[PDB]
Amino acid sequence: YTEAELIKLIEQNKHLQRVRADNCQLVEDIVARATRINLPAYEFLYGDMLAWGVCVEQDVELGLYYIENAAHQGLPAALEQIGRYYSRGTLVQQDKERAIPYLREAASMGNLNARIHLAELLLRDYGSPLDYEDAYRWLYNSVTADKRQHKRITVLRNGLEQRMPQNVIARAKRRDTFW
Amino acid sequence: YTEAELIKLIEQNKHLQRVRADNCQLVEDIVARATRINLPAYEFLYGDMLAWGVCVEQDVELGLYYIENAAHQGLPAALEQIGRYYSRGTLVQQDKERAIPYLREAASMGNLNARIHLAELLLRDYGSPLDYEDAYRWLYNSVTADKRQHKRITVLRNGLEQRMPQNVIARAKRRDTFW
Amino acid sequence: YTEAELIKLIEQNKHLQRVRADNCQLVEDIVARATRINLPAYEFLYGDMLAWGVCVEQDVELGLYYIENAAHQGLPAALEQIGRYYSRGTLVQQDKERAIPYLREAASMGNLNARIHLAELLLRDYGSPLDYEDAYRWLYNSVTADKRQHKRITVLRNGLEQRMPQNVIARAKRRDTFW
Amino acid sequence: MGKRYVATPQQSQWEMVVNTPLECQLVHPIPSFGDAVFSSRANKKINLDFELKMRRPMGETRNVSLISMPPPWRPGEHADRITNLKFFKQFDGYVGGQTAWGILSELEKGRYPTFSYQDWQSRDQRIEVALSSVLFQNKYNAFSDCISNLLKYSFEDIAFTILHYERQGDQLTKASKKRLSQIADYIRHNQDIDLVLVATYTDSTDGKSASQSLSERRAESLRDYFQSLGLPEDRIQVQGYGKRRPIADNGSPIGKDKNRRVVISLGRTQ
Amino acid sequence: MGKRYVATPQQSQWEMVVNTPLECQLVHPIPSFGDAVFSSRANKKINLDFELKMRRPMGETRNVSLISMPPPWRPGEHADRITNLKFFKQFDGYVGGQTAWGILSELEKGRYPTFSYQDWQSRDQRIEVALSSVLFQNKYNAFSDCISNLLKYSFEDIAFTILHYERQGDQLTKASKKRLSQIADYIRHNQDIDLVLVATYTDSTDGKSASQSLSERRAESLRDYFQSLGLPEDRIQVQGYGKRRPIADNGSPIGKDKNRRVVISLGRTQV
Amino acid sequence: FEDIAFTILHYERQGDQLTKASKKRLSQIADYIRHNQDIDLVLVATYTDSTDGKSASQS
């Protein structure tokens, strides 16, 4: 795999499906690239392979370690995955308040899933109003092509708007924000 | 055209008719003389040609610009034309109080049309009594051969006389005034 | 086209009709001139063609991009185009107060349509009563041969005057010279 | 109760801020509200502007009532309704024409001109603003004196001037010298005039070289005169066009005198 | 007997914190509670913010009642109900529009603007927060003087400017000089701008080389001027185009006047 | 400490300076560090885009 294709597959959540479609012929290459070169895309892929035990044996601790290393280097999907693992209690002990920072960082980097999940957590009182602004900002200038996700984003935006004054809302809609 | 003949045609308001009678064969010469030599008679002629769009295309701004240049150099007919354009709202936004100075200058130079129009504007309260004297003076020693215009001038003179004291009237009739 | 020819075509809102008449032979010429040398008139023409799909495939996003490219150059017609698009909601979300700053620059450049639309928007309460003086000045100094446009400018001037102290109207009517 | 903005006799003061032959400005500070400014300018017509300048700008356009209320120290006198104005949003209140002179007159009688309207900044409640007549008489006399000493022409009346020369000599005619004196007065009293354009040109009687020499000598004399008024040399522009560009029919005695002329054009920075 | 936060006549004080042509700020410290801040800023339109800043932030979003209560030393006077606001969790209380001017007006009349609400930090009991009108009038006069001296335009109004040059020389027209002076005032007082694009053009009178040289000359003159205004060199990006890229018909003097232009674009990022 | 322990900052397209938001976050980090004496380790991992050459990118 090239790095760019692996990154794009990671963002679409089809890296595991692709590796299965290859009948797991590149497993040795993935292991070598992740463990030795420390390529964040390959680190995330190897961590997901170890964690959920596809082809390779199921080693939850080591898989989470390599996912955390991909996050260390800063792969937004890795941060989002760790955040949703903490928020939903998948392979880890459920701690939404611990999930919040990971999701916040992934959202700040540009991960739409992280943005939606963070807004949902905040609307359940699992954070502080001192986030709403940023979260609202991140939900404001976000472009999606899925009508279902678009409706969900609009609903979350209105839910956040019902909780901040006009001063803060004005400041949020009037800031430089990208990704 | 010679300069003197063009000036006399301008004073009679037949320069455009003459140019039409020539079937617009000297248009290039008119353009060259106005734009390059800056001859006030040709500047006024070119401005009228551009403004009302005869033979040449209708360019109101440029025509008024060249008329204003003819006025810059000091052609009395140009000043009178700009004044009556402002007073009647022809090709410009109607502002009689703005028209007044142009008409006043043209009248002071000797333009009979400017004198009559200025007296008419003053008699409609579109100026100040501090003009009447001069205007009255300009209407007093003015010689016309048209009986209709002579009657109009006499009427305007009486209208101005009904508004100034005997002191000012005496001073007005007793001053050096020409053209 | 040379460029002055193209500019004159643009000012008369006939450039797209001109390109249509010429049977779409200028397509690649326009594209190359717009995106290679960045000629503002060619940039505006290309943006218009991309916007409405004239002799090219329609591309609203890039069309507006090239219209903006022309506007930031200084073209009076691109600025008015951007302001009118923002005010009408054509090809973009409707936004009057965003429109006004664009219309102001085109009006200051001499664009009559920008002046008229700026006056119409200000009389509709889409700007602070601090843009009234400039709009009135621009309309007051406007010259036109179309009696419909003349009457429109006069009516808009009266409407603007019905919101100003008349010490501001007098200030709008003052000039730095006799002309 | 209501909010009434007026200067108490210990606070009331009138000032003549601008006292020049080109402008007069009488200012009455209304405490906690702002200023009341009467301005008269050099012009051919009678003009006075009254501006109620407010520290906090006008919130919305409101109908205003102008009354001539008697002061407290005048029992038994009733109030006279003067007129109804309109104060506009984000603009100072303006009264002009005969009503501004009437405000000055009501102040001369010892009364209080009162503007009453509903203030947007004050929860849409009715407020009054009064002009005090205490210490008004002396400043009204000074204002009348300055109005007496105002130029009877404005920048519009002199910005373009055409002067004529005598048949023999380098001197202007009598009327042209009078107009040049008017121009010099306005220039010497106005510091906002930046540009002077001089375009001398003569009759066809002399030779072309002679015409150019006469025109240039006249232009240089006028440039030196304009320098004498205090303008820097980088502002004055002078050009001699000789016997070219005739505005009148050369050959007639009157036409040649017409063409023997100078154009003086002023330009200000308002 | 509930909790009432008000400054006693000996404790009340009003201060002008920010007094600049870009912002005016008036602060009333409410003892044991926090501050009440009136902020006005340079803009094309009337604007006033009232912010009730609390030492202990708002615990829950609550409905707040704004009343114009008479002070104790005014017997026989009833209280005027002004409005109902909503104070939000962990955000400073905000009042804006005509209601903030109404609070200032009720203070100008010797009354106490009182906000009443249920406090989360107080076992959900009703508490009052009042602004004292003692020593207010002098500072209200200073605040209104500051408001009168505010610039009548904001950054949005100077972001994109097309200036014009005269036919002879390298000096800007009168209107262009005025607009440049406005830009200079705002920049002098703000200096936050991070992108200053100065693209100069010329008419078709001179040759290509001469026009390019003149345009670059004027561009660098403007760059030096903007540096003198205090902006760092890195933010300024000047570019001369000479006779290239006309916007008007160079066949008329009006077109040449339109073509001798300079485009100054100011850009900043709030984030 | 949970909100700032991991931070990712961005650089401008041309130059060696951080963006505005990245400088703001760096100021937040500096405040927390200057007020907290218990912070022992700082790990910094800069890396750039592919536009420049590999040696240039490393430099």
First to last CA, chain B: 25
D56/E82 touch (CB, cutoff 8 Å), yes or no? no
Torsion region of E46: left, alpha or beta (phi above 0 gives left; psi -120 to 50 gives alpha): beta
List of chain C residues whose C-beta atoms are within 8 Å of the C-beta of residue E183: none
For residue A15, the surrounding DSSP H or E stretch is helix A15-21
Cα–Cα distance, D6 to D29 (Å, whole number): 9
What distance in Å separates the CA atoms of residue C29 and residue C46, rounded to the nearest whole number? Answer: 10
Listed in sequence order, the DSSP H helices in C1-146 are 4-11, 15-21, 27-32, 40-52, 60-73, 76-88, 96-109, 112-122, 132-140
Rounded Cα gap, residues A84 and A113, in angstroms: 9
Directed axis angle between helix C4-11 and helix C76-88, to 10°? 30
Contacts of B163 (CB under 8 A, 6+ apart): B129, B132
Chain centroid offset of residue A178 CA: 17
String of DSSP letters for B20-31? HHTTS-SHHHHH
CA distance E102 to D213: 75
| Residue ranges of C 99-128 with Cβ closer than 8 A to chain D | 128
Chains in contact with chain B (at least 3 beta-carbon pairs closer than 8 A): C, D, E
State the sign of the Cα–Cα–Cα–Cα dihedral A80, A86, A87, A88.
positive
Q: After which residues is chain A broken (C to N over 2.5 A)?
A: none
Q: How far is B32 from chain E (nearest CA, A)?
A: 13
Bridge-based pairing of strands E15-20 and E23-30 is antiparallel
How many Å apart are CA B43 and CA B68, to the nearest integer?
A: 9
Give the full edge-to-edge strand order of the sheet including D261-268. D160-164, D261-268, D193-201, D236-240
Structure tokens that stand for B152 in this block: 């109009």
Q: Please name which of E12, E10, E21, E75 lies closest in space to residue E186, comparing C-alpha atoms.
A: E21
Burial class of residue E228, CB neighbours in 10 A (0-12, 13-18, 19+): exposed
Checking A136-139 for CB contacts under 8 A at 24+ apart, the result is: A136/A160, A136/A161, A136/A164, A136/A169, A136/A172, A137/A172, A137/A173, A137/A175, A137/A177, A138/A107, A138/A108, A138/A177, A139/A115
Q: Which residue shows structure tokens 């017409």?
A: D258
Close Cβ partners of B50 (under 8 Å, ≥ 6 residues apart): B56, B57, B58, B59, B60, B62, B63, B66
Integer angstrom CA distances of residue B29 from D56, D104, D246, E123: 62, 62, 18, 96
**D114 forms bridges with which residues in the sheet?**
D67, D130
Helix, strand, coil percentages, rounded to 5, for chain E = 30, 35, 40
D184-201 in b/e form (b: 16+ CB < 10 A) is ebbbeebeebebbbbbbb
Place of tokens 């009689």: B96
CA distance C62 to D29: 58
**Is the CA virtual torsion B1, B5, B7, B8 positive or negative?**
negative
Radius of gyration of chain C (CA): 18
Query: What is the spatial order of strands in the sheet that E34-41 belongs to?
Result: E15-20, E23-30, E34-41, E49-54, E93-96
CB A69 within 8 A of CB A79: no
Cβ atoms within 10 A of the Cβ of A21, count?
Answer: 9
* DSSP assignment of chain B: --HHHHHHHHHHT-HHHHHHHTTS-SHHHHHHIIIII--HHHHHHHHHHHHHTSSS---HHHHHHHHHHHHHHT-HHHHHHHHHHHHHTSSS---HHHHHHHHHHHHHHT-HHHHHHHHHHHTTTSS-HHHHHHHHHHHHT-----HHHHHHHHHHHHHHHTTS-HHHHHHHHTS----
- Cited resolution, angstroms: 3.0
Rounded to whole angstroms, the Cα distance separating B97 from B102 reads: 10
Quick check: helix, strand or coil at residue D129?
strand
- Please indicate whether, in this complex, the C-beta atoms of F20 and A101 are within 8 angstroms of each other: no
Residue type, A94: Q
Q: Is D63 exposed, middle or buried (0-12, 13-18, 19+ CB in 10 A)?
A: exposed
DSSP 8-state class, residue E215: H
Which of B68, B71, B93 lies closest to C157 in CB terms?
A: B93
Contacts of E96 in chain A (CB under 8 A): 166-167
For D162, how many CA atoms within 13 A lie in the half-sphere containing its CB? Answer: 24
Residues of F in contact with A39 (CB under 8 A): none
| DSSP per-residue letters across A47-104 | HHHHHHTSSS---HHHHHHHHHHHHHHT-HHHHHHHHHHHHHTSSS---HHHHHHHHH
Give dist(CA D150, CA D146) in Å, integer. 6
Q: Which residues contact C75 (CB under 8 A, 6 or more apart)?
A: C10, C40, C41, C43, C44, E247
Tokens linked to D170: 């380098």
| B129 shares contact with chain C (CB less than 8 Å) | no
Please check whether residue C17 is in contact with residue C29, taking contact to mean a CB–CB distance below 8 angstroms.
no
SS3 at position A167: helix
Would you tell me how many other CB atoms lie within 10 Å of the CB of residue B176? 9
Place of tokens 């004399």: D221
The answer to whether the CB atoms of C76 and E245 lie below 8 A apart is: no
* Beta strands across the sheet bearing E3-5: E3-5, E125-130, E112-119, E62-69, E80-87
The reply to whether residue C177 touches residue D51, judged by beta carbons under 8 angstroms, is no
Q: Which two tokens stand for residue E25?
A: 């700020």
Whole-angstrom distance, CA of residue E141 vs CA of residue D11: 15
From the list D146, D143, D140, the residue with the least C-alpha distance to D42 is D146
Interchain contact C7–B (C-beta under 8 A): no
Which of C7, C130, C176 is the closest to E249 by Cβ? C7
Q: Compute the Cα dihedral for C21, C23, C29, C34 and give only its sign.
A: positive
Question: How far apart, in whole angstroms, are the C-alpha atoms of residue C165 and residue D93?
Answer: 7
**β-bridge partners, E200:** E240, E262
Measured CA to CA, the distance from residue E147 to residue E162 in angstroms comes to: 29
Q: Which of E41, E105, E146 is the best substitution to test chain D (most D C-beta atoms within 10 A)?
A: E105
Cα pseudo-dihedral C21, C26, C31, C34, rounded to 10: -80
Which positions in chain F touch E269 (Cβ < 8 Å)?
A: 20
Cβ-in-10-Å burial (0-12, 13-18, 19+) of D24 comes to: buried
Strands E3-5 and E125-130: parallel
Terminus-to-terminus CA distance in chain E, angstroms? Answer: 46
Give the residue among C76, C72, C73, C102 at the shortest CA–CA distance from C87.
Answer: C102
Instruction: Name the nearest CA neighbour of A169 among D145, D218, A160.
Output: A160
- For residues C37 and C45, what is the distance between their CA atoms, to the nearest angstrom? 14
Helix (H, G, I), strand (E, B) or coil at D239: strand
> Computed from CA positions of residues A13, A15, A21, A24, in that sequence, does the dihedral angle turn out positive or negative?
negative
**Nearest CA-CA partner of A31 in A66, A71, A7:** A66
- Distance (Å, whole) CA F45 – CA A70: 13
| Strands D193-201, D236-240: pairing kind | parallel
Using the Cβ of A89 and the Cβ atoms of chain F, whether some distance falls under 8 Å is answered with: no
Q: Which two tokens stand for residue B53?
A: 């769009």
Cβ-based neighbour number of residue E243 at 10 Å: 21
* B72:D263 CB<8 A: yes
Length of chain A, please? 179
- Tell me the residue type at E203: D
Give D81's strand partners: D67
Kind of pairing between the strands at E112-119 and E195-200: unpaired
Contact of B100 with B84, CB cutoff 8 Å:
no
d(CA C114, CA C122): 12
Closest residue in B to C136 (Cα) is B93
B93, C140: Cβ pair inside 8 Å? Answer: yes
Closest of D106, D129, D104, D126 to residue D117, by C-alpha: D126
Give the residues across from E20 on adjacent strands: E23
Q: Which residue has the tokens 């930090």?
A: E121
The C-alpha atoms of residue C80 and residue C111 are separated, in whole angstroms, by: 8
* Cβ(D246)–Cβ(D204) below 8 Å: yes
Q: F20 and chain E: CB distance < 8 Å anywhere?
A: yes
Please name the helix (run of DSSP H) or strand (run of DSSP E) that holds residue E37, with its range, or none.
Answer: strand E34-41
| C141 contacts on B by Cβ (under 8 Å) | 93
Q: Strand pairing of D125-130 and D3-5? A: parallel
CA end-to-end span of chain C: 36
Q: Give the pairing type, strands E236-240 and E195-200.
A: parallel
The separation between CA E189 and the C-alpha centre of its own chain, rounded to angstroms, equals: 11
Alpha-carbon torsion A8, A14, A17, A21, what sign?
negative
With residue E29 as reference, give the H or E element that holds it.
strand E23-30
**Consecutive H or E run containing D164:** strand D160-164
Q: Report the alpha-carbon distance of residue C155 to residue A99 in Å, rounded.
A: 64
DSSP letter for D66, please. E
C-alpha span between C135 and F40 (Å, rounded):
64
Whether the CB of D25 is below 8 Å from some CB of chain C: the reply is: no
Torsion of the alpha carbons at E134, E140, E143 and E148, rounded to the nearest 10: 180
How big is the CA angle at D69 (ends D67 and D74), to the nearest 5 degrees?
Answer: 165
Residue E187 CA to residue C6 CA, distance in Å, equals 38
Half-sphere exposure of C104 toward its Cβ, with a 13 Å CA cutoff? 21
Question: Alpha carbon of E72 to those of C35, D53, E29, F30: distances in Å?
Answer: 75, 36, 20, 50
- How far apart, in whole angstroms, are the C-alpha atoms of residue D48 and residue D26? 11
Among the residues of D168-207, which ranges form H helices? 174-189
**Which amino acid, D211?**
S
Asked whether A107 and A93 are in contact (CB, 8 A), the reply is no
Is E45 in the A-facing interface, judged by CB distances under 8 Å? Answer: no
D102, D116 contact by CB (below 8 A): no
Any idea what DSSP says for residue E235? G
The angle subtended at Cα C134 by Cα C129 and Cα C138, nearest 5°, is: 135
Decide: A81 and A102 in contact? Cβ < 8 Å.
Answer: no
- Sequence-distant (≥ 6) Cβ neighbours of residue E138 within 8 angstroms: E14
User: Quick one: which of A21, A43, A23 has its CA closest to A33?
Assistant: A43
Comparing C-alpha atoms, which of C54, A31, A72, D247 is closest to residue B6?
Answer: D247
Residues facing residue E54 across a β-bridge: E34
Approach to solving: cryo-EM
Q: Which of B134, C167, B83 is nearest to D44 (CA)?
A: B134
Exposed / middle / buried, residue F54 (Cβ in 10 Å: 0-12, 13-18, 19+): exposed
Burial E95-110 (b: 16+ CB within 10 A, else e): bbebbbbbbbbbbbee
Among chain B residues, the shortest Cα distance to D239 is held by: B73
Q: From B162, B158, B154, B115, select the one nearest B135 (Cα to Cα).
A: B115
Give the residue from D175, D197, D202, D199 showing the smallest Cα distance to D258.
D202
b vs e for C14-33, b when ≥16 Cβ sit within 10 Å of the residue's Cβ?
Answer: ebbebbeeeeeebeeebbeb
The chain B residue lying nearest D254, using CA atoms, is: B179
